[PDB]
């Protein structure tokens, strides 16, 4: 393996900056490469190119824009192993899961291309509202918003770059992608696929750099017409106060509850809970982060979950381990603190805590109470609390007391009751007898409270990054 | 007893001959309705086609206003109309008033659904780059003249459910109620006339089937036929309509599939309410219970108990089981009951008939060689057919030529949804009786149960077409 | 000399007897297609109904992958298929290859449109407060077996435009191409077979109308009939379908209304391209010019100049005007020309006929007592009818039994839209010739021009039904 | 006639310790007072609203619609009573003020019926991946929660009801904050909702001084959505305080009327004058600059000039076309734009006159884009005519504005007019008609600094709802 010096895509050209940021693999410390450390003047060059490209891009037919997206997705499928191998090292994601992330990104790009090209407008009748305006009709068609700034997260630096880029591009918007620093190589590899597909100069560009130099600058810039961001809740809250009146989409944290009723299939509930809670070592916003279980089935459910947590593989990304090293030392320190607080307050550790560097073994706690930090705080690590409840009303109350409202799971055999519970839960999506998940990517993805703003899922993302233009006239 | 008249071009008209209508439960003379000739039908259709141009060019809000006024009049006169409706079709007095109230609800809902219908704007650039400046402006238009044919069992509700969706969209209408039910249809017509519906926009036709039955459907003036009635009549209409669009609500033999894990008391409650409502003279009634062997004995006893509590008597006393529409209908039902007894079915409640008042009959051990397992009785008789597997319940359910609705009683909803996908029916109700309601929901039948989708927005969509205006932006 | 075979249940089969097919322009023997019996049609339908369960239970993604593969094969073989299609229906070589490429585009578009199939969730509380916890989950389902009947004039495009929308939605299909056009239909079928379409999901039928014509439509296995052809055959199909859903694209007599303020050069260009494309053998062709008298002499002169430049000759030479499909078609067009001449119409270009190759005929001073003012010729003849007012143009346009499309040539768009509202047609094109495209736009007729709405999403909607599952939230 | 008005808070009418006296801008007449709420009183309004939300969101749509219909019937009944006071409060013509109340009732009724039949969707997992073919998503609408509606002085009843009714039908609870000049009208609208029997806490009002509760009402954690109409500077401040919460902003405009050589100049002049000078130009949606092709400019300017010379200038009680502006600062700002245009050499076709805050209508010709009047929203009766020689120049000048609410195009070539409309950076283009918000079922939106979000009845309902997805696997 030889570390490479990567370049940003700026107005159809690949550009270095005077300074750069060296990226290391979180699992091994191996140097992977460097990405440019852009200056504010270089961000200005990116946005000037994007605004100059907008007129010719938005005036192309939908089929012409869709052709570029399909070509980019075919190139990603062609290079999925080459890109997935680097994505795996960059964010300590299992090799197979990293290659699957690249394939999922090609699927979302293809799906957005076809969803976006068949968007329709509407014709409204004046006579629906008043008799005197019966000959007046409004011809309402969709239009792009302009320049979209897409900011991807470290945990899905390609998938949640494509989930923003393709819906924005099909609608006729121009895009600047700002990947996270830990994930910027993978983001620039995605950019190479769009460049090789022949995306016109300035239509798609990348920005890489340090938060202290360009962090607020890329968002506050008046060239930006829309900010689409996935990342931490505190950073998300900052973007909301910098966007001003400009539309935004935020995908932030979660503390998804899994409510287990007395009539649940406990073995199946345990399977779905462990798959959801410990995927990518719990470093997912949509992940079962707390089990709210009825007292009478709690001992048997905990035994079923424990059996499965003990069998999860813990190790290196190259080995496709279920639990891989966390993204950085600060993240593992934070998770260890939550583990220590639950232990010191009397929670039962059903599986042992171990920390090898930043590789934390999966910890399952029973008898977790609302005074413990782990009942509320999003860990972004492999630790799952089980909180016992006496009534369904109590589970709803504890679930809704969270500042997060991304998704919830309900495990029961009474679906009419599960729907009644789902109506009361302050979340975007409720999965019945299955783990929480963003997929399938055509379904809406949204969070209530501090989990975000806006509705994603492919068609919803296109609708968010478009506006309408109405032309009104009188028939004679 | 009154001599009723047809609404034709804003005028009330008698014909040379009349048909006297008697109450099926008492034989009380209620009045007479005109026996229209083919020439008088021609004048109804000429009047409607003449009124169509001004009617379709009104705004949606203007058409909605006439419907809201007609619905307000039906609410005002619900007791007065319901009292006559009750007698004309031997429906319980309170149920007849409820029917008029429900009709007013449907009319008001159709008026507001229809006035906000929107068109679409399509892009040529979605299909080919060279046509990126070509757009299509697609707006809805009425089909023209709608012939609405209502049934005896819901002569006001299933007249208004066709009339109001047709009218809001700009169509003109001719209502042909059944002879037994024609007074009720003409009473509904009075509310539209009092509401100020323009002359010729809404009209009525009454007469004998041997004189005008085929004539009204085959007439070139009619652009759409919307009918509710028996399957043999519907089949004839489908042939006579030719290429013209149709809505048909025909026979039903709705199955209620009861699984081993069902709440049997809840299943029995819904099955008896669904099977015996209006003495079983409903297309959406539960007409056969397909029950898994292990719970069949318990379910049969629970159903029997509730059948024994049904009141049997006169419409004026709000009996659950009233006399059937006519002698021919009760002879047919008696014949199906005799066939089942002769073939060995167990009568849990046995056959009793006084005039055309048949007591509710419940049969167990009904087999596929019995007429009652398949034929729609339109009477108060319910067969219970035992099955060994869910696959057998699906197969027997789907072997019917009918497929209006089905019910599934079980605590496993993902499994119930999987069964619902396999059933050749329009709607599947989980842990409830089969029913048309609520009236905003789609209502349709597969195979010989009909054509087209009803329910308010669906009926509006059915009785409209589109007009596309295409041009190139410069 | 090749003996073509039908695709039946995944295998290619001949029949005992065969129909030899000849190139209409040269008499060249192209090969033979099977002469299926009624029993062979039964076997095709049984194989399709058997395949339906496993096909409808596939995911939309899986059904779309087959359609995309079939479309790629059609693109790969466009020259090979186009070459035979050109000979079989005497269509210009380049235009025949273009038909194949357009079919692949429609198939790809249908696969992507149908895979995004959405349902609806309706609220009981929208209609009545007591049912606020009742919801309806409404999902789309295939109708079952679709019989697609393609026309000779678009034997691949109007086979693929029916087949792909039906297949993506989970329907199984039987394609019956016209006898003159069956080799092209079976060549299209090869692409679906090589794509690996499961056995029985897609099948073909070929045979004589006297043996299987009515039989294929009356058969109770068929759940939907999607046909393109002439009005008299379509009228027969509506009756034989009974209550089953249909899509019919029949005759057209599209008017081109030219007002005093029209851009006459643009009107002439569009009128000539639309009227004489494929020798006028198109349902959507401009078939009558209704022009305001003050601009008629100049409009007729500019049309005449462009008509005289059309090439007249053989399909292999990409001539604009090629020989008509058969002798009967050319005799029918000749009779219309003679009637117009005998009634005083002015021949701006002269009639000539060599075999079934009729030179393009333009008539002026055509009146409403001439057959050519009303009857669909399906040949290279265009009448110009002078009018004194826009009201007269609308009246004459609407007096036609046909109503597929119309064109309006004027610089006053708001007035053109007001005229479009009054025309009894499916689509009105402003300042352009009538056309079906783009294939995402709706395509439909009024009066005797058809039944149902075509255009990709509309065709998918027509060949699906809904299944509503209703339950109460607790 | 001056009354002590009260806020509607949790079904009761409350005064505060301090009050704000409201005077008629045209005459100085004392109209009454409105409470000067404290931050703790705002907290009580929001606590009441969140408490009422649970039982309101779980009602059926038909039950919520019945309250809106009853409230609209009450507004029609009291249209003269409310309009008489609204006219004095914001110096709007008496008949125009009554018409505003009637229009509000129309919007409320249309919102009740539009909202009650909104639907959910069912999505197939098999549309995206074969392995999830038995997974389906049942997606239903849900309210966003508590909506803070902030109405503007120029439409204090119409653009209060335009936010309240769409929010309520969807199951949201509402707090209306009228502008201080327009708070009596806002509280009169609240009386109709209260008499209609709207449950306690479902609909509430807030009145007070900007220096006591201005930022507080927006920054409050209880508020889940802010729906505002008003000035661009205030709207931009709301964007800073909303954080992650969804907003709708209806801000300023500088609508262009593009007049081509083939236009019907009499039709263009009539529409331009009706739109520009309605309510003395104090409307965001109003023709605020004429971009005319030079060949027809002398004729168009003469036709506009004759119509402007006929507009009545006077008091709201006399239904004058031009009434006194809302306040002295507003009139001073308008006079400044007029003076800049005069000093830079524009031709004053109609004479400038100012008596108190009543400015006579001023029409300028030969306005060049170095003049402030070419760009700045006056909110007063002044209109510039800017001559251009090409359509491309008219499009460039039109789009150079920071505003993008609406535009008008006057021409007989509609295919060309549609091609121009595609290039204009606005929410709506009206062909051969003045810009206007109506009909209220149509979308109403502005690009650039004119706003955020899409209004019009169905659009406002969609904006103030979210979705709840329930995903399960068929077996």
Author numbering:
A (entry chain D): 0 to 475
B (entry chain A), C (entry chain B): 2 to 475
D (entry chain C): 1 to 475
Quote the study that presented this structure, word for word:
The structure revealed a covalent modification of the enzyme at the active site residue C284, which could be modeled as β-mercaptoethanol although this compound was not present during purification. Hence, the enzyme must have been modified following heterologous expression in E. coli. To eliminate this modification and generate a true apo-state of the enzyme, the C284S variant was generated and crystallized. Its crystal structure was also determined by molecular replacement, with a tetramer of the wild-type protein as search model. Due to its higher resolution, the structure of the C284S mutant is presented and discussed here. Starting at the N-terminus, residues 2–118, 145–252, and 450–464 form the cofactor binding domain containing a Rossmannoid fold (residues 145–252, cyan with the remainder of the domain in blue) which harbors five β-strands and three α-helices and mediates binding to NADP. The two other domains are the protruding domain composed of residues 119–144 and 464–475 (magenta), which is critical for oligomerization, and the catalytic α/β domain encompassing residues 253–445 (yellow). The catalytically active cysteine, which is responsible for the nucleophilic attack on the carbonyl carbon of G3P, is located at position 284, in close proximity to E250, the other key catalytic residue. In all chains of the wild-type and C284S variant a cis-peptide was observed while only half of the chains in the reference structure from S. mutans were modeled in the cis configuration. As this peptide bond is within 11.2 Å of the active site, it might be relevant for the proper function of the enzyme.
GapN catalyzes the irreversible oxidation of glyceraldehyde 3-phosphate (G3P) to 3-phosphoglycerate (3-PG) while reducing NADP+ to NADPH. As S. pyogenes lacks the oxidative part of the pentose phosphate pathway, GapN appears to be the major NADPH source for the bacterium. The GapN-monomer from S. pyogenes, like its counterparts from other organisms can be subdivided into three domains. The monomers assemble into a tetramer displaying D2 symmetry which is formed by two interlacing dimers with dimer-dimer contacts primarily mediated by the protruding domain, while contacts within each dimer are formed by a β-sheet of the protruding domain interacting with a β-sheet of the catalytic α/β domain via salt bridges as well as α-helices (residues 232–251) of the Rossmannoid fold of each chain.
